[PDB]
């Protein structure tokens, strides 16, 4: 159900992503600064199919992964899209389209509850699920591999639930607009442009 | 060339805006807080035609003005769109489409020069033009009327010039994306939702 891939998403998962129309994605990194630290792996999950851990190769562009990220017809769900896309933007010059983010959604629904805005907070509140280091190792251990996959496999039902809550509060159109802005926000951070919406 | 209108944009200026496809807009207010202070007037300029000062009437929705603001086919140019649209959003529940802003553009081009991001800074730098109180008075004076119109009439060439500069630096697509976000940002401020793009 989980396969570690070197350099790129597999052709089989590219086709599966295209058939699904929806995937979930996150990353493992050497630190918390998208423009400085290293991108080690990208996790991609296709609901009903499984998960790939893509090990980044500095000498190889992950062509099929970048196609998925750029595809308007495939929705990419994240639990911290600005963070992950910042790494993908800085590392591969990747400009994504059709991204959604559970953190953005949770910030619209519960702006004052930081703990609810994390994926562990959301999985606990909504699903009753309690979510439990050297990602550049020559070999990923079974413990590393199982952990690396947990977040992308729990994200689809969380996103489905947040969509319903947003819709019931008449805030889904605002979330859709905010999700649409994420790639431009990532671009603003890449260029050190700051908050262009103040006065 | 300038006409003070009570309650709403005139039918003649609605037609002229539709023919032009582009207008410039700003406001006069009782203070600097869009969700607290009063919206006194809305200025609208149609290039080549003239300017209307719309005096806001609390008992009258400015129907034609709101149609212009909502029209996808009419670009509305501002020199501080988030500020002005915040007033229009709070006062009339107006949700604009196809807005552009010289301040957003200047913040992308010159992020570190606050003086260049104001309309007076832009008019001076680009055009060599040097831009020179009770907006709720029973009557607007000729001095008030001429001042209220200056900013919207100088904005069209400034926006044209900023577009060229953005395009030459390959930053126009980013500005277009940021301008597209302005109404959603205004919505976020209306709901006290803050920065939904942090982590």
Coordinates of C-alpha atoms in Angstrom, one line a residue:
Chain A
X1 CA 0.0 0.0 0.0
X2 CA 3.1 2.2 0.3
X3 CA 6.0 2.2 -2.1
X4 CA 9.2 4.2 -1.8
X5 CA 10.1 5.7 -5.2
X6 CA 13.4 7.2 -6.3
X7 CA 13.4 10.5 -8.1
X8 CA 9.8 10.7 -9.3
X9 CA 6.2 9.6 -9.0
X10 CA 5.6 6.4 -10.8
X11 CA 3.8 6.3 -14.1
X12 CA 1.1 4.1 -12.5
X13 CA 0.4 6.7 -9.8
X14 CA 0.3 9.5 -12.4
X15 CA -2.4 7.5 -14.2
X16 CA -4.2 6.7 -10.9
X17 CA -4.1 10.4 -9.9
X18 CA -5.6 11.4 -13.3
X19 CA -8.4 8.8 -12.9
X20 CA -9.1 9.9 -9.3
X21 CA -9.0 13.6 -10.0
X22 CA -7.9 14.1 -6.3
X23 CA -4.7 13.4 -4.4
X24 CA -3.2 14.3 -1.0
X25 CA 0.4 15.5 -0.6
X26 CA 2.9 16.4 2.1
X27 CA 6.6 16.5 2.5
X28 CA 9.5 15.6 4.8
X29 CA 12.2 18.2 5.1
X30 CA 15.4 18.9 7.0
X31 CA 13.9 22.0 8.6
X32 CA 11.1 24.5 8.7
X33 CA 12.4 27.1 6.3
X34 CA 11.1 26.4 2.7
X35 CA 13.7 28.6 1.0
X36 CA 16.7 27.3 3.0
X37 CA 16.2 23.7 4.2
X38 CA 16.2 20.5 2.2
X39 CA 13.3 18.8 0.7
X40 CA 13.8 15.1 1.4
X41 CA 10.6 13.3 0.3
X42 CA 7.2 14.1 -1.2
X43 CA 4.4 11.8 -0.1
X44 CA 1.4 11.4 -2.5
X45 CA -1.7 9.4 -1.8
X46 CA -4.4 8.4 -4.3
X47 CA -7.6 7.5 -2.3
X48 CA -8.5 3.8 -2.6
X49 CA -5.1 3.0 -4.3
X50 CA -2.2 3.8 -1.9
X51 CA 0.7 6.0 -1.2
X52 CA 4.1 6.7 -2.8
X53 CA 7.0 8.2 -0.9
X54 CA 9.1 10.1 -3.6
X55 CA 12.7 10.4 -2.5
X56 CA 14.0 13.6 -4.0
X57 CA 17.1 13.3 -6.3
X58 CA 19.0 16.6 -6.7
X59 CA 20.1 15.5 -10.2
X60 CA 16.6 14.6 -11.4
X61 CA 13.5 16.7 -11.9
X62 CA 10.5 14.7 -10.6
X63 CA 8.7 15.2 -13.9
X64 CA 5.4 13.3 -13.3
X65 CA 5.1 14.7 -9.8
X66 CA 5.4 18.2 -11.2
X67 CA 2.8 17.4 -13.8
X68 CA 0.4 16.4 -11.0
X69 CA 1.1 19.5 -9.1
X70 CA 0.6 21.7 -12.1
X71 CA -2.6 19.9 -13.3
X72 CA -5.7 22.0 -13.1
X73 CA -7.8 18.8 -13.3
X74 CA -6.2 17.1 -10.3
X75 CA -7.0 18.6 -6.9
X76 CA -4.0 18.4 -4.5
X77 CA -5.0 18.4 -0.8
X78 CA -2.5 19.5 1.8
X79 CA -2.5 19.9 5.6
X80 CA -0.1 22.9 5.3
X81 CA 0.0 23.8 1.6
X82 CA 1.9 27.1 1.9
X83 CA 4.7 25.3 3.7
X84 CA 4.9 22.3 1.4
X85 CA 4.5 24.3 -1.8
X86 CA 7.1 26.7 -0.6
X87 CA 9.6 23.8 -0.6
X88 CA 8.4 22.6 -4.0
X89 CA 8.6 26.1 -5.5
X90 CA 12.1 26.7 -4.2
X91 CA 13.5 23.3 -5.0
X92 CA 11.9 22.5 -8.4
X93 CA 10.5 25.9 -9.5
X94 CA 7.1 24.1 -9.3
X95 CA 4.0 26.3 -9.7
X96 CA 0.9 24.4 -8.5
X97 CA -2.7 24.8 -9.5
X98 CA -5.9 23.5 -7.9
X99 CA -4.5 23.1 -4.4
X100 CA -6.6 23.0 -1.2
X101 CA -5.4 23.1 2.4
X102 CA -7.0 21.9 5.6
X103 CA -5.0 24.5 7.6
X104 CA -6.5 27.3 5.6
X105 CA -10.0 25.8 6.0
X106 CA -9.5 25.4 9.7
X107 CA -8.2 28.9 10.0
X108 CA -11.5 30.1 8.4
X109 CA -13.7 27.9 10.6
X110 CA -11.8 28.2 13.9
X111 CA -9.5 31.3 13.7
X112 CA -8.8 31.4 17.4
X113 CA -8.0 27.7 18.0
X114 CA -4.4 27.0 16.8
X115 CA -4.5 23.4 18.1
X116 CA -7.6 22.7 15.8
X117 CA -5.8 24.0 12.8
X118 CA -3.1 21.2 12.8
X119 CA -3.8 17.9 11.2
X120 CA -3.5 16.1 14.5
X121 CA -6.1 18.5 16.0
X122 CA -8.4 18.0 13.1
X123 CA -8.0 14.2 13.0
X124 CA -8.8 14.1 16.8
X125 CA -11.8 16.4 16.7
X126 CA -13.4 15.1 13.5
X127 CA -12.3 11.5 13.3
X128 CA -11.5 10.5 16.9
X129 CA -8.1 9.5 15.6
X130 CA -4.9 10.3 17.6
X131 CA -1.9 10.8 15.3
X132 CA 1.3 9.4 16.9
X133 CA 13.8 11.8 11.8
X134 CA 16.7 11.4 9.3
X135 CA 14.7 11.5 6.1
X136 CA 18.0 11.6 4.1
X137 CA 19.1 8.2 5.3
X138 CA 20.4 5.8 2.6
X139 CA 17.4 3.6 3.5
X140 CA 14.0 4.4 4.9
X141 CA 13.0 2.1 7.7
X142 CA 9.5 0.5 7.9
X143 CA 8.8 2.8 10.9
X144 CA 9.8 5.9 8.8
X145 CA 7.8 4.6 5.8
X146 CA 4.6 4.0 7.9
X147 CA 4.9 7.4 9.6
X148 CA 5.6 9.3 6.4
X149 CA 2.3 8.0 5.0
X150 CA -0.1 8.6 7.9
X151 CA -0.8 12.3 7.2
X152 CA -1.7 11.9 3.5
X153 CA -3.9 8.9 4.1
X154 CA -6.0 10.6 6.9
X155 CA -6.3 13.9 5.0
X156 CA -9.1 13.0 2.4
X157 CA -11.9 12.4 5.0
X158 CA -10.8 15.5 6.9
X159 CA -11.0 17.6 3.8
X160 CA -14.4 16.2 3.0
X161 CA -15.6 17.0 6.5
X162 CA -14.2 20.6 6.4
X163 CA -15.9 21.2 3.1
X164 CA -19.3 20.3 4.6
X165 CA -18.7 22.5 7.6
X166 CA -17.6 25.4 5.4
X167 CA -20.6 24.9 3.2
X168 CA -23.0 24.8 6.2
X169 CA -21.6 28.2 7.4
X170 CA -21.7 29.8 3.9
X171 CA -17.9 30.1 4.1
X172 CA -17.0 27.6 1.3
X173 CA -16.8 30.2 -1.4
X174 CA -14.3 32.2 0.8
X175 CA -12.2 29.1 1.3
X176 CA -12.3 28.3 -2.4
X177 CA -11.1 31.8 -3.1
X178 CA -8.3 31.4 -0.4
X179 CA -7.2 28.1 -1.8
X180 CA -7.0 29.6 -5.2
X181 CA -4.6 32.3 -3.8
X182 CA -2.2 29.8 -2.2
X183 CA 0.2 29.6 -5.2
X184 CA 0.3 33.3 -5.6
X185 CA 1.0 33.6 -1.9
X186 CA 3.8 31.1 -2.3
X187 CA 5.2 33.3 -5.2
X188 CA 5.1 36.4 -2.9
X189 CA 7.1 34.5 -0.3
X190 CA 9.6 33.3 -2.9
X191 CA 10.2 36.9 -4.0
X192 CA 10.3 38.3 -0.5
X193 CA 7.4 40.5 -1.3
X194 CA 5.6 40.4 2.1
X195 CA 2.0 41.6 2.6
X196 CA 1.0 43.4 -0.5
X197 CA -2.6 43.9 0.8
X198 CA -1.9 46.4 3.6
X199 CA -2.3 50.1 3.4
Chain B
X1 CA -16.4 67.4 -16.2
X2 CA -17.3 66.6 -12.6
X3 CA -20.9 66.2 -11.4
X4 CA -22.0 65.6 -7.8
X5 CA -24.7 62.9 -7.7
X6 CA -27.0 62.1 -4.9
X7 CA -27.4 58.5 -3.8
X8 CA -26.2 56.6 -6.9
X9 CA -24.1 56.7 -10.1
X10 CA -26.1 58.2 -13.0
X11 CA -27.5 56.0 -15.7
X12 CA -25.3 57.9 -18.2
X13 CA -22.1 57.0 -16.3
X14 CA -23.2 53.4 -16.0
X15 CA -23.5 53.2 -19.8
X16 CA -20.2 55.1 -20.2
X17 CA -18.5 52.7 -17.8
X18 CA -19.9 49.7 -19.8
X19 CA -18.7 51.2 -23.1
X20 CA -15.2 52.0 -21.7
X21 CA -14.8 48.7 -19.9
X22 CA -12.5 50.4 -17.3
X23 CA -13.1 53.0 -14.5
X24 CA -11.2 54.4 -11.6
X25 CA -12.7 54.7 -8.1
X26 CA -11.8 56.0 -4.7
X27 CA -13.7 57.2 -1.6
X28 CA -14.0 59.9 0.9
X29 CA -14.6 58.8 4.5
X30 CA -14.8 60.1 8.1
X31 CA -11.8 58.0 9.2
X32 CA -9.4 55.3 8.4
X33 CA -11.2 52.2 9.7
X34 CA -13.4 50.6 7.0
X35 CA -15.6 48.7 9.4
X36 CA -16.2 51.6 11.8
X37 CA -16.0 55.0 10.1
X38 CA -18.5 56.5 7.6
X39 CA -18.4 56.3 3.8
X40 CA -19.2 59.8 2.6
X41 CA -18.7 59.8 -1.2
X42 CA -17.5 57.4 -3.9
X43 CA -15.7 59.0 -6.8
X44 CA -15.9 57.2 -10.2
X45 CA -14.0 58.4 -13.3
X46 CA -14.6 57.1 -16.9
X47 CA -11.5 57.9 -19.0
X48 CA -12.3 60.5 -21.7
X49 CA -15.7 61.2 -20.2
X50 CA -15.4 62.7 -16.7
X51 CA -16.0 62.0 -13.1
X52 CA -19.0 61.6 -10.7
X53 CA -18.9 62.2 -7.0
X54 CA -21.6 59.9 -5.6
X55 CA -22.8 61.2 -2.2
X56 CA -23.8 58.2 -0.1
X57 CA -27.4 58.2 1.1
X58 CA -27.9 55.9 4.1
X59 CA -31.5 55.2 3.0
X60 CA -30.6 54.4 -0.6
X61 CA -28.6 51.5 -2.0
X62 CA -26.4 52.9 -4.9
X63 CA -27.7 50.3 -7.3
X64 CA -25.9 51.3 -10.5
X65 CA -22.6 51.8 -8.6
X66 CA -22.9 48.4 -7.1
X67 CA -23.5 46.9 -10.6
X68 CA -20.3 48.5 -11.8
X69 CA -18.4 47.2 -8.8
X70 CA -19.8 43.7 -9.3
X71 CA -19.3 43.7 -13.1
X72 CA -16.7 41.2 -14.3
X73 CA -16.5 43.0 -17.6
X74 CA -15.6 46.4 -16.1
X75 CA -12.2 46.8 -14.6
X76 CA -12.2 49.0 -11.5
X77 CA -8.8 50.7 -10.8
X78 CA -8.1 51.9 -7.3
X79 CA -5.0 53.5 -5.6
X80 CA -5.8 51.6 -2.3
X81 CA -8.4 49.0 -3.2
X82 CA -8.3 47.0 0.1
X83 CA -9.2 50.2 2.0
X84 CA -11.9 51.5 -0.4
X85 CA -13.5 48.1 -0.9
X86 CA -13.5 47.5 2.8
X87 CA -15.8 50.6 3.2
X88 CA -18.0 49.5 0.3
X89 CA -18.2 45.9 1.6
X90 CA -19.1 47.0 5.1
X91 CA -21.5 49.8 4.1
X92 CA -23.4 48.2 1.2
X93 CA -22.4 44.5 1.4
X94 CA -20.8 45.1 -2.0
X95 CA -18.6 42.3 -3.4
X96 CA -16.5 43.5 -6.2
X97 CA -15.0 41.7 -9.2
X98 CA -12.2 42.7 -11.6
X99 CA -10.5 45.2 -9.3
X100 CA -6.9 46.4 -9.8
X101 CA -4.8 48.4 -7.4
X102 CA -1.8 50.7 -7.9
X103 CA -0.7 50.2 -4.3
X104 CA -0.6 46.4 -4.7
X105 CA 1.3 46.8 -8.0
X106 CA 3.8 49.3 -6.4
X107 CA 4.3 46.9 -3.5
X108 CA 5.3 44.2 -5.9
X109 CA 7.6 46.5 -7.9
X110 CA 9.1 48.5 -5.0
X111 CA 8.4 46.6 -1.8
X112 CA 10.8 48.7 0.3
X113 CA 9.8 52.2 -0.7
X114 CA 6.6 53.1 1.1
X115 CA 6.6 56.6 -0.4
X116 CA 6.5 55.2 -3.9
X117 CA 3.5 53.0 -3.0
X118 CA 1.2 56.0 -2.5
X119 CA -0.6 57.7 -5.4
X120 CA 1.3 60.9 -4.8
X121 CA 4.6 59.1 -4.9
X122 CA 3.6 57.3 -8.1
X123 CA 2.2 60.4 -9.8
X124 CA 5.5 62.3 -9.0
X125 CA 7.9 59.5 -10.0
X126 CA 6.1 58.4 -13.2
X127 CA 4.2 61.5 -14.4
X128 CA 6.2 64.4 -12.8
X129 CA 2.9 65.5 -11.2
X130 CA 2.8 66.8 -7.7
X131 CA -0.6 66.1 -6.0
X132 CA -1.7 68.9 -3.7
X133 CA -12.2 67.8 5.0
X134 CA -15.9 67.8 6.0
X135 CA -17.2 65.4 3.3
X136 CA -20.6 65.2 5.0
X137 CA -21.3 68.9 4.6
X138 CA -24.8 69.8 3.3
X139 CA -23.0 71.2 0.2
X140 CA -19.7 70.3 -1.4
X141 CA -17.6 73.3 -2.3
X142 CA -15.8 73.8 -5.6
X143 CA -12.6 73.2 -3.8
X144 CA -13.8 70.0 -2.3
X145 CA -15.2 68.8 -5.6
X146 CA -12.0 69.5 -7.5
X147 CA -9.9 67.8 -4.9
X148 CA -12.2 64.8 -4.6
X149 CA -11.7 64.2 -8.4
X150 CA -7.9 64.5 -8.7
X151 CA -7.0 61.0 -7.6
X152 CA -9.3 59.1 -9.9
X153 CA -8.4 61.2 -12.9
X154 CA -4.7 60.7 -12.5
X155 CA -4.9 57.0 -11.8
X156 CA -5.5 55.6 -15.4
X157 CA -2.0 56.6 -16.8
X158 CA -0.4 55.4 -13.6
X159 CA -2.0 52.0 -13.9
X160 CA -1.1 51.8 -17.6
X161 CA 2.6 52.6 -16.7
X162 CA 2.7 50.1 -13.7
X163 CA 1.3 47.4 -16.1
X164 CA 4.2 48.0 -18.4
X165 CA 6.8 47.9 -15.6
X166 CA 5.3 44.8 -14.2
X167 CA 5.3 43.1 -17.6
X168 CA 8.9 44.0 -18.3
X169 CA 9.9 42.4 -15.0
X170 CA 7.8 39.3 -15.6
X171 CA 5.7 40.2 -12.5
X172 CA 2.5 41.0 -14.2
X173 CA 1.0 37.5 -13.8
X174 CA 1.7 37.8 -10.0
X175 CA 0.1 41.2 -9.9
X176 CA -2.9 39.8 -11.8
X177 CA -3.2 37.0 -9.3
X178 CA -2.9 39.4 -6.4
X179 CA -5.5 41.8 -7.8
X180 CA -7.8 38.8 -8.2
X181 CA -7.4 38.1 -4.5
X182 CA -8.3 41.6 -3.3
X183 CA -12.1 40.9 -2.8
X184 CA -11.4 37.7 -0.9
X185 CA -8.9 39.6 1.3
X186 CA -11.6 42.2 1.9
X187 CA -13.9 39.3 2.9
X188 CA -11.3 37.9 5.3
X189 CA -11.0 41.4 7.0
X190 CA -14.8 41.7 7.2
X191 CA -15.0 38.4 9.1
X192 CA -12.0 39.1 11.3
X193 CA -10.2 36.1 9.9
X194 CA -6.7 37.5 9.8
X195 CA -3.8 35.8 8.0
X196 CA -5.1 32.4 6.9
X197 CA -1.8 31.7 5.0
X198 CA 0.6 31.3 7.9
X199 CA 1.7 28.1 9.5

